[PDB]
mmCIF file of C-alpha atoms and ligand atoms in Angstrom:
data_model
loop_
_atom_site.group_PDB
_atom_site.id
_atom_site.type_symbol
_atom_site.label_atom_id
_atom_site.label_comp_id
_atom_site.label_asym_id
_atom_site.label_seq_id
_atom_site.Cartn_x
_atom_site.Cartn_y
_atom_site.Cartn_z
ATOM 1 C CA UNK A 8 35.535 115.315 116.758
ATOM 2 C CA UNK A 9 35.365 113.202 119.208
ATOM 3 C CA UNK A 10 34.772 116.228 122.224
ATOM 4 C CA UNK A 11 32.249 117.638 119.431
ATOM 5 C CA UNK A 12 30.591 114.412 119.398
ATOM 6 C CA UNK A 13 30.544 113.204 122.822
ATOM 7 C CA UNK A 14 29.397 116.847 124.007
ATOM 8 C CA UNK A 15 26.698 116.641 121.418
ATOM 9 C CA UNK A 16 25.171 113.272 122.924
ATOM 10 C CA UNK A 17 26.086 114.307 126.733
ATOM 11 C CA UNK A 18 28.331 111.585 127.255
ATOM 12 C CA UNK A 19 30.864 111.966 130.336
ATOM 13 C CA UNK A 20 31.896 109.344 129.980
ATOM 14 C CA UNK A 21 34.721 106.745 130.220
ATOM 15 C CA UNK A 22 36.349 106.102 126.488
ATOM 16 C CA UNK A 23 37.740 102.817 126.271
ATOM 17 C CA UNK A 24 36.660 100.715 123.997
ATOM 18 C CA UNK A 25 34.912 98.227 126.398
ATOM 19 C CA UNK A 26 30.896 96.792 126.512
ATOM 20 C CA UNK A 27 30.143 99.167 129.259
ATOM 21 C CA UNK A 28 30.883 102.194 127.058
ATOM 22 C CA UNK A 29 29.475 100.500 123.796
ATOM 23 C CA UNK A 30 26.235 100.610 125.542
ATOM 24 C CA UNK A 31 26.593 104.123 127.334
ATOM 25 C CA UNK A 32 27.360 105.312 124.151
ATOM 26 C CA UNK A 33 24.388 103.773 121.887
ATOM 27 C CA UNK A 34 22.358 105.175 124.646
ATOM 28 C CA UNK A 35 23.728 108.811 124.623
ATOM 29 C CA UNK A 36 23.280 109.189 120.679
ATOM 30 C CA UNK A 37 20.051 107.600 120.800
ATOM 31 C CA UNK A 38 18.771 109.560 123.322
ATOM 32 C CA UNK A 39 20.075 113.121 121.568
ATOM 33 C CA UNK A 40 20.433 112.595 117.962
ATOM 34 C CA UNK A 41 16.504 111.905 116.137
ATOM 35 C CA UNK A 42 16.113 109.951 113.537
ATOM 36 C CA UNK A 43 14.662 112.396 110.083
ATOM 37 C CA UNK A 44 14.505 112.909 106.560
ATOM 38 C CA UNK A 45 14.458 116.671 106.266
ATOM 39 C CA UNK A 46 17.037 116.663 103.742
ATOM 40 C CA UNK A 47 15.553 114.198 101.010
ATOM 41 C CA UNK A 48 11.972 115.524 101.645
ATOM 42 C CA UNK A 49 13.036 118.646 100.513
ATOM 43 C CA UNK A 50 14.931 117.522 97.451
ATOM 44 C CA UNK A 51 18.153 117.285 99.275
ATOM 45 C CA UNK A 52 19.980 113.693 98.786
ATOM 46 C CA UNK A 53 22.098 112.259 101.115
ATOM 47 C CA UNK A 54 24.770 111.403 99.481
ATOM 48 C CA UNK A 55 28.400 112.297 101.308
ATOM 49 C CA UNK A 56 29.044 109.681 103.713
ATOM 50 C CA UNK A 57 32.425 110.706 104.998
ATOM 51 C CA UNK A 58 33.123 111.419 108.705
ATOM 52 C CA UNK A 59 33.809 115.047 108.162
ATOM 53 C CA UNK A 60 30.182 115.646 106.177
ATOM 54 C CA UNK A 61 28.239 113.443 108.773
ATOM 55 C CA UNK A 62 30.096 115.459 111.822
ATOM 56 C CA UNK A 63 29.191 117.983 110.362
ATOM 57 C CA UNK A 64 25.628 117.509 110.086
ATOM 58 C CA UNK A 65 24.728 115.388 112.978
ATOM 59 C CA UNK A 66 26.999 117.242 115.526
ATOM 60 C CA UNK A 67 28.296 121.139 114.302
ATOM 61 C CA UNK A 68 24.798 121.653 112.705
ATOM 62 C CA UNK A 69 22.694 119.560 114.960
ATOM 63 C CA UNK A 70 20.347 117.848 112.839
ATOM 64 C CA UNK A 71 18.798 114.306 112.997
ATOM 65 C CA UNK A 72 19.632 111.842 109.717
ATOM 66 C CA UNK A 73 18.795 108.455 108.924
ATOM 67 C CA UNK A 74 20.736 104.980 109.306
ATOM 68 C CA UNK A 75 22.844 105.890 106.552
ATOM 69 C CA UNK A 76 24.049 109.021 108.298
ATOM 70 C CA UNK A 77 23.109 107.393 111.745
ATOM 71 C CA UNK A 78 25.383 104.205 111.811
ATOM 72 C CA UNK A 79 28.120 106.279 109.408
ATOM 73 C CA UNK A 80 28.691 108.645 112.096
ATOM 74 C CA UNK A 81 28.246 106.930 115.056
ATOM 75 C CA UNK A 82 30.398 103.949 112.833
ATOM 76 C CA UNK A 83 33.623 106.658 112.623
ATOM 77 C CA UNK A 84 33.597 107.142 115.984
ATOM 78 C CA UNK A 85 33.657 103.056 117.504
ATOM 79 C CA UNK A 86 36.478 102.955 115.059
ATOM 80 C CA UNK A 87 38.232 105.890 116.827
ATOM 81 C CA UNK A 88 38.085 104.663 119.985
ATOM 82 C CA UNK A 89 39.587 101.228 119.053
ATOM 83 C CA UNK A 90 36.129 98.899 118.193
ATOM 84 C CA UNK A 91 36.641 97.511 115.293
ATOM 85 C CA UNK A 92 34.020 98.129 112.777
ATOM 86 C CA UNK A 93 32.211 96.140 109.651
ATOM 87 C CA UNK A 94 29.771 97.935 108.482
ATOM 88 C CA UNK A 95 26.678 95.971 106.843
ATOM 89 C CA UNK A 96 24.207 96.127 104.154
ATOM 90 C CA UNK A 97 20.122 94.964 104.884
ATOM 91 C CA UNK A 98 16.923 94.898 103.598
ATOM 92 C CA UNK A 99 13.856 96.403 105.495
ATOM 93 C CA UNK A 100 10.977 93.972 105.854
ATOM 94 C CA UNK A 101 9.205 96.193 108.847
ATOM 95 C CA UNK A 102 5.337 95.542 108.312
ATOM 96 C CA UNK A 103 6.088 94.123 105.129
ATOM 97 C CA UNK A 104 3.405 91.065 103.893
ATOM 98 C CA UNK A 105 2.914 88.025 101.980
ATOM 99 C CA UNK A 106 2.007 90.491 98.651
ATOM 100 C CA UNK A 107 6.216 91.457 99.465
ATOM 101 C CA UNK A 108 8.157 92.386 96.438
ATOM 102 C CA UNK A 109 11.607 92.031 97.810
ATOM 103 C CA UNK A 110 12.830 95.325 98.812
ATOM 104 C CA UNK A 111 15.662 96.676 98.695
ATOM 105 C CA UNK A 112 19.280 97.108 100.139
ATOM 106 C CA UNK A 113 18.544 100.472 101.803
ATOM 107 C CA UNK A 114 19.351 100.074 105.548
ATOM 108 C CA UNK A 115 23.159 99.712 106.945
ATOM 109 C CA UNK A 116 24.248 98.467 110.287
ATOM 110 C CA UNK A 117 27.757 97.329 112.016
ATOM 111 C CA UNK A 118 29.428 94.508 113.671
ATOM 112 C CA UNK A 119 31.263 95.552 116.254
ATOM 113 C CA UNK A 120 34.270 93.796 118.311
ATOM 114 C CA UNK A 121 36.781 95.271 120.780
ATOM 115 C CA UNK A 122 39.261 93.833 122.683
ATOM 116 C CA UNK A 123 38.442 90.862 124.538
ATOM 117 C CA UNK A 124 35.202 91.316 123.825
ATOM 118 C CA UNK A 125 32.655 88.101 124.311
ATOM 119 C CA UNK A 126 31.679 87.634 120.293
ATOM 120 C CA UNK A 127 30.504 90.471 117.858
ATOM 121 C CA UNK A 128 28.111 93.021 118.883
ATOM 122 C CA UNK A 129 25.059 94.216 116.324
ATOM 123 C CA UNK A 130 24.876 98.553 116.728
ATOM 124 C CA UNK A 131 22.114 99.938 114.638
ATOM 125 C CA UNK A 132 21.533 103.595 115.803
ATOM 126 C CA UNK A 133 19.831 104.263 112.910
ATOM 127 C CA UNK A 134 16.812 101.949 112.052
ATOM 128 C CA UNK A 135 14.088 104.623 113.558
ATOM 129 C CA UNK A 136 10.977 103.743 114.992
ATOM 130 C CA UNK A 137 12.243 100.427 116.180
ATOM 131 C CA UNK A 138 16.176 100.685 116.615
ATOM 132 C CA UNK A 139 17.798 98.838 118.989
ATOM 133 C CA UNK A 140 19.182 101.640 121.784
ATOM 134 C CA UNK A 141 21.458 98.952 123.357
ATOM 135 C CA UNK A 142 24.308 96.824 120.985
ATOM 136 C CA UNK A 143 23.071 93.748 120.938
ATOM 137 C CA UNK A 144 25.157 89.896 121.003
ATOM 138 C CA UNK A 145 25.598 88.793 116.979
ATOM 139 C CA UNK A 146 24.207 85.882 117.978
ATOM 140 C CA UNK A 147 20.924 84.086 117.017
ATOM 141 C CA UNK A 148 17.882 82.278 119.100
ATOM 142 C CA UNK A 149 19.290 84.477 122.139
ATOM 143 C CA UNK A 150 15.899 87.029 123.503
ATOM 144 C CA UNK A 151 17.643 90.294 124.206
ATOM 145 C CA UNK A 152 16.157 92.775 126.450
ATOM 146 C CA UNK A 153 17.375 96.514 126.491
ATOM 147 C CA UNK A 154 15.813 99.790 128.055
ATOM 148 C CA UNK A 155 12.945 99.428 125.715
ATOM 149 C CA UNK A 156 11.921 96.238 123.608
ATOM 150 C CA UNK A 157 13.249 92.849 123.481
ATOM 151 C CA UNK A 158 15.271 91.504 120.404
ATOM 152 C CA UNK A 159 15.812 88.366 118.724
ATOM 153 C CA UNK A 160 18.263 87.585 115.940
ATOM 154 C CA UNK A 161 17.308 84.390 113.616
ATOM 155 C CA UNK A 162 18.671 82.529 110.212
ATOM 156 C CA UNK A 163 17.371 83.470 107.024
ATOM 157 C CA UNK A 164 19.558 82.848 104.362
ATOM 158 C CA UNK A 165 22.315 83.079 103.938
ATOM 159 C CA UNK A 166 22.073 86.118 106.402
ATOM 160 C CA UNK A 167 20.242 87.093 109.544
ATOM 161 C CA UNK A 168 16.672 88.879 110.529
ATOM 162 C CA UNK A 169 16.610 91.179 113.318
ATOM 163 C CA UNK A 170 13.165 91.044 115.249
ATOM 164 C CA UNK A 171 11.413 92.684 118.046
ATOM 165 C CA UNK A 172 8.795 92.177 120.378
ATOM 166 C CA UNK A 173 6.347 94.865 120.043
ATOM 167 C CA UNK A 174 3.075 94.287 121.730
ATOM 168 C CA UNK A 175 2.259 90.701 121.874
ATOM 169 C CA UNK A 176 3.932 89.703 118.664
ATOM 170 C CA UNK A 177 7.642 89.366 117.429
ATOM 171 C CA UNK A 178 7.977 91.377 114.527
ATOM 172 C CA UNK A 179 10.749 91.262 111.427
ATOM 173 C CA UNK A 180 12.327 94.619 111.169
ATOM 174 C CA UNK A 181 15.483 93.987 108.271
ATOM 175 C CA UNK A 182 17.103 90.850 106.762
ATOM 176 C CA UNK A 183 20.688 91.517 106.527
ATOM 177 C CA UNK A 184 24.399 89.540 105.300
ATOM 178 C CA UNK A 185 27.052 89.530 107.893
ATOM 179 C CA UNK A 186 29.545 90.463 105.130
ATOM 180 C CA UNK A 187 31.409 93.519 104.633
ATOM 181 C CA UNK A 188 30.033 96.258 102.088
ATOM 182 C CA UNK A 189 32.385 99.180 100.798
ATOM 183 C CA UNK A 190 31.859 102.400 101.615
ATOM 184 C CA UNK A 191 31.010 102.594 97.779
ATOM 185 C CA UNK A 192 27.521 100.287 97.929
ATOM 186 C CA UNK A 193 26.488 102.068 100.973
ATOM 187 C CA UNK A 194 26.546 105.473 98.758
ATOM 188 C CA UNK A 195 24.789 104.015 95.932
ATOM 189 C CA UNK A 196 22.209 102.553 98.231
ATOM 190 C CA UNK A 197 21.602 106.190 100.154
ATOM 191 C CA UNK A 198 21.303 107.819 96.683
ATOM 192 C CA UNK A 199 18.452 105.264 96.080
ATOM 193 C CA UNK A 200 17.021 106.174 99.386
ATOM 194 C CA UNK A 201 17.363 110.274 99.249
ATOM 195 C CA UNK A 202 16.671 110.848 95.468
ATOM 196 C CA UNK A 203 14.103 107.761 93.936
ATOM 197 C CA UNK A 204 10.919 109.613 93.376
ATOM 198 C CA UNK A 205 9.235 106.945 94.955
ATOM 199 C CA UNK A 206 10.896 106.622 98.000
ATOM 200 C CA UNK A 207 9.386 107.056 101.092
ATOM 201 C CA UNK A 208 12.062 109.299 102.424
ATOM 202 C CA UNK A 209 11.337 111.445 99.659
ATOM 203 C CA UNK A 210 7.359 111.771 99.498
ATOM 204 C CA UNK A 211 6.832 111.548 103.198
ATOM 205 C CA UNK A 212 8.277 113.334 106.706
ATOM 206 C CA UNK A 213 9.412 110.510 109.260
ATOM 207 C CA UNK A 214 11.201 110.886 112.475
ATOM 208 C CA UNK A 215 11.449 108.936 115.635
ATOM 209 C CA UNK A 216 13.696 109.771 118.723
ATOM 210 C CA UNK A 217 14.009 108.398 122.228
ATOM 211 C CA UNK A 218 13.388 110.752 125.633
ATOM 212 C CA UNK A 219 12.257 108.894 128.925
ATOM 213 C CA UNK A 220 11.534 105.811 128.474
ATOM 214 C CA UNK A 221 9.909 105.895 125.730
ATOM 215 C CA UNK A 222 9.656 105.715 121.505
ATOM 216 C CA UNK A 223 8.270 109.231 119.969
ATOM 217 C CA UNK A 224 7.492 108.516 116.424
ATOM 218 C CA UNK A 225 6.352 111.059 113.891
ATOM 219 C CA UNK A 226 4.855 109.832 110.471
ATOM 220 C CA UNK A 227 3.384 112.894 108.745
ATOM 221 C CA UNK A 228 1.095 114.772 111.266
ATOM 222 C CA UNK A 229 0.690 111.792 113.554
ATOM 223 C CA UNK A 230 2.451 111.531 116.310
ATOM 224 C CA UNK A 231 2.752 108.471 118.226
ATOM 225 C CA UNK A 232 4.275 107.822 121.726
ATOM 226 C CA UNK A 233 5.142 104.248 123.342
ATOM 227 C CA UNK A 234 5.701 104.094 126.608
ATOM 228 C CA UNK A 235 5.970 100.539 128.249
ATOM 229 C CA UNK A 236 4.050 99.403 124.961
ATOM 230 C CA UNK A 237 0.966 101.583 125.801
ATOM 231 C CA UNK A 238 0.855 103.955 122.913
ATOM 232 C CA UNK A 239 -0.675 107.909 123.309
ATOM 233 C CA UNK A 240 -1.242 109.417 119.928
ATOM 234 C CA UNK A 241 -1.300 113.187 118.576
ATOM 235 C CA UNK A 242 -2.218 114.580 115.257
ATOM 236 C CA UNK A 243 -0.787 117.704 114.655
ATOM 237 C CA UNK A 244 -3.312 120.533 113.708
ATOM 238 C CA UNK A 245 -0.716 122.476 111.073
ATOM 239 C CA UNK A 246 2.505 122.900 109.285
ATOM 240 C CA UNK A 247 3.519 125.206 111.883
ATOM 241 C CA UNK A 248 2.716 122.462 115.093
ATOM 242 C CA UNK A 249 4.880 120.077 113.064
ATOM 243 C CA UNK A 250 7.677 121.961 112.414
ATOM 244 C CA UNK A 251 7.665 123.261 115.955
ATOM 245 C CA UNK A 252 7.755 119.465 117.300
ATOM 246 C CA UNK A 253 10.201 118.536 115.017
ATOM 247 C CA UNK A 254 12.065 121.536 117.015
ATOM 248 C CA UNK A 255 11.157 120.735 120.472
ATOM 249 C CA UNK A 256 10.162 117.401 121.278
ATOM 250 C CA UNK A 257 13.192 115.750 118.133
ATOM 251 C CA UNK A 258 15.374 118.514 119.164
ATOM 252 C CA UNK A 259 16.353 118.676 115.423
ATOM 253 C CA UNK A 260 17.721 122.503 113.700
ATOM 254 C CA UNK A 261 15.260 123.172 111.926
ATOM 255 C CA UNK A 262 16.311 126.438 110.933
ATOM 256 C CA UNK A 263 19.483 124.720 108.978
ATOM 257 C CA UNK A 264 16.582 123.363 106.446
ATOM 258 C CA UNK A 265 16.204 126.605 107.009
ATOM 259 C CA UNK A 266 13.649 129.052 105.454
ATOM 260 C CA UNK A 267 10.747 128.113 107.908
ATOM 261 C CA UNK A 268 8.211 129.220 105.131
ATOM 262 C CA UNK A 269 9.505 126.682 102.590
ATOM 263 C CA UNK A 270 9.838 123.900 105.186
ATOM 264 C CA UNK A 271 6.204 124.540 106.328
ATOM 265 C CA UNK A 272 4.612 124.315 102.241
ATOM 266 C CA UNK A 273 6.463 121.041 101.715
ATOM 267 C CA UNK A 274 5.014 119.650 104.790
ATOM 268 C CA UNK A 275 1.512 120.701 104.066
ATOM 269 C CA UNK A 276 2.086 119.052 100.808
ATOM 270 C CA UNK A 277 3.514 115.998 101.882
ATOM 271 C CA UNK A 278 1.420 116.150 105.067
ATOM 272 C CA UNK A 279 -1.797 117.724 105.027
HETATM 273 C C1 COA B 2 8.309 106.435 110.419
HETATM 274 C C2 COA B 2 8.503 105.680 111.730
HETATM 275 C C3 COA B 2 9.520 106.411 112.614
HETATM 276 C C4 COA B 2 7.157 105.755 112.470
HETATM 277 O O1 COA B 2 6.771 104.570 113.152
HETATM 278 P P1 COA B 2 5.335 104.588 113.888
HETATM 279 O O2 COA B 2 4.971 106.064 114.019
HETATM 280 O O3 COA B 2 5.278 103.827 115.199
HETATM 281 O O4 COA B 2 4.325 103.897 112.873
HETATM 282 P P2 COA B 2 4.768 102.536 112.180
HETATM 283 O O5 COA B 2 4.159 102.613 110.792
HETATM 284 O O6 COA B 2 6.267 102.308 112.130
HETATM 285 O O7 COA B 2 4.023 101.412 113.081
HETATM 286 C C5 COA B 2 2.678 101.005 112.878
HETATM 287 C C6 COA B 2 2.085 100.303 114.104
HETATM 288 O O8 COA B 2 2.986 99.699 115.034
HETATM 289 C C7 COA B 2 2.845 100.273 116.334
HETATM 290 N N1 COA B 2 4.112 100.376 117.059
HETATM 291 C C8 COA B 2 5.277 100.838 116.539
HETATM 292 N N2 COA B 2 6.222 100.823 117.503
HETATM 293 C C9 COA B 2 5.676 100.361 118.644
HETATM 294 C C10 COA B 2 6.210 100.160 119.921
HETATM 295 N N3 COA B 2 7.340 100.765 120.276
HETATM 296 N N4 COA B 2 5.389 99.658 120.907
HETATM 297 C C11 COA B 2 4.064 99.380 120.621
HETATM 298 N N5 COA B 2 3.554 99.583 119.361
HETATM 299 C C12 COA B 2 4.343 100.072 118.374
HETATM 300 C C13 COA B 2 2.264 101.653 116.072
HETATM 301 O O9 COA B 2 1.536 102.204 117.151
HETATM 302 C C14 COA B 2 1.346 101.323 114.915
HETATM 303 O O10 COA B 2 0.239 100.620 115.414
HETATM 304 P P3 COA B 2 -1.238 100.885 114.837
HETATM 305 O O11 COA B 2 -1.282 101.851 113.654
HETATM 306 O O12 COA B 2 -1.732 99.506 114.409
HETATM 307 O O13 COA B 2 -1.969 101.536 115.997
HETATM 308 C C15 COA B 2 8.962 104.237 111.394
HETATM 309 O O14 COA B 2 8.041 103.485 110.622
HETATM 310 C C16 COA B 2 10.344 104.190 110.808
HETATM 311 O O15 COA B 2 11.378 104.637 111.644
HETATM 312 N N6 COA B 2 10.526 103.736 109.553
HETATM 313 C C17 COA B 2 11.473 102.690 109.199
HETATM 314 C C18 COA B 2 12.799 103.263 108.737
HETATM 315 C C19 COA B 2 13.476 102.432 107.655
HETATM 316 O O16 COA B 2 12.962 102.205 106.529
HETATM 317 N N7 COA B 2 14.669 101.943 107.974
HETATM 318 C C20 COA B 2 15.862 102.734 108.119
HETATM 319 C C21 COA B 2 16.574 102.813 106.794
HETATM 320 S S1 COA B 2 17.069 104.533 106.598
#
């Protein structure tokens, strides 16, 4: 904690706190650490957001999380090395219409500066399916391109919307304020997330990871894989094929969930 952490994401690895290493590092835990709701879709809420429970989940215990547990941890470390971290509050509007009741504040992100640094920097390691795997300039009408997808930051508000070009179409992923939240708000807004009987995190399985160069999403039993925008898709047959992809291909634990039988029924439930 940090040689737990950067072992865990195969980083090696300069550590000063410059843009070089912001971006090797966004990489790295993108590229090791899955996205997943294991926890909340089997009636466990996410709910300590300190550096020692997150470490201990993401790293010792090598499990996936989601942006809560995402931009907490990776959030603890920036700090460590000597960025200097705000951590932000946003709404996900991802596919949203028109019909839209406003959601609500259940995404965080940071704003990241370092010494001598050019302006702010937006890190979001945790969005899923469409998180940015480079930081990205807090600065709006600029197209950013990264390993994957390009990104575009606009006004609206009173805060900003993050978007990305996927396909032939930029798309609104979360509307967010560039003000600081407490620690506090973001722990009432994960409780929302892990425990509200009609949260998506709670009635459904989601993960998404990165492994070259492309986006592996799981939603349920499908299985969807974008690779220079082309997508491949995979349905699962079983429980069992899930669970074992969630293993393999996420490279999450899955034995710290961790009684495969009882994993397996909540997925053919949820599923299935
Ligand atoms: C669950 C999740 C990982 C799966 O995403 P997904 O498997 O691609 O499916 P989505 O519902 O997100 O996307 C739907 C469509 O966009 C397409 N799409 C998504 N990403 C794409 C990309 N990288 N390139 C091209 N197409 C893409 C999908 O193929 C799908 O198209 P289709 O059904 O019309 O063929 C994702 O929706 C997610 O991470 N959820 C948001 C998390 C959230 O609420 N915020 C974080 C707070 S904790």
């Amino acid at each position: 904690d940090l040689t737990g952490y950067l072992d865990r994401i195969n980083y090696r690895g300069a550590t000063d706190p410059t843009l070089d290493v912001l971006r090797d590092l966004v990489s790295a835990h993108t590229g090791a650490i899955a996205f997943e709701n294991l926890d909340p879709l089997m009636g466990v809420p996410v709910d300590d957001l300190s550096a020692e429970a997150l470490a201990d989940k993401l790293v010792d215990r090598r499990r996936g999380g989601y942006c809560y547990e995402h931009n907490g941890l990776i959030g603890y470390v920036l700090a460590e090395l000597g960025y200097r971290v705000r951590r932000l509050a946003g709404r996900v509007v991802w596919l949203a219409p028109p019909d839209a009741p406003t959601p609500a504040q259940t995404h965080t992100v940071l704003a990241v500066t370092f010494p001598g640094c050019q302006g702010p920097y937006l890190v979001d390691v945790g969005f899923g399916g469409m998180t940015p795997t480079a930081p990205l300039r807090l600065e709006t009408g600029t197209v950013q391109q990264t390993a994957l997808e390009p990104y575009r930051l606009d006004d609206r508000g009173d805060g900003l919307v993050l978007q990305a070009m996927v396909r032939d179409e930029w798309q609104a992923l979360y509307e967010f304020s560039t003000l600081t939240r407490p620690q506090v708000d973001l722990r009432v807004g994960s409780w929302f997330v892990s425990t509200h009987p009609t949260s998506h995190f709670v009635t459904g399985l989601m993960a998404a990871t990165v492994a070259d160069d492309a986006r592996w999403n799981l939603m349920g039993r499908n299985l969807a894989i974008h690779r220079r925008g082309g997508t491949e898709k995979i349905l699962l047959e079983d429980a069992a094929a899930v669970v074992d992809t969630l293993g393999d291909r996420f490279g999450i634990n899955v034995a710290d969930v961790g009684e495969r039988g009882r994993l397996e029924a909540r997925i053919d439930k949820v599923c299935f």
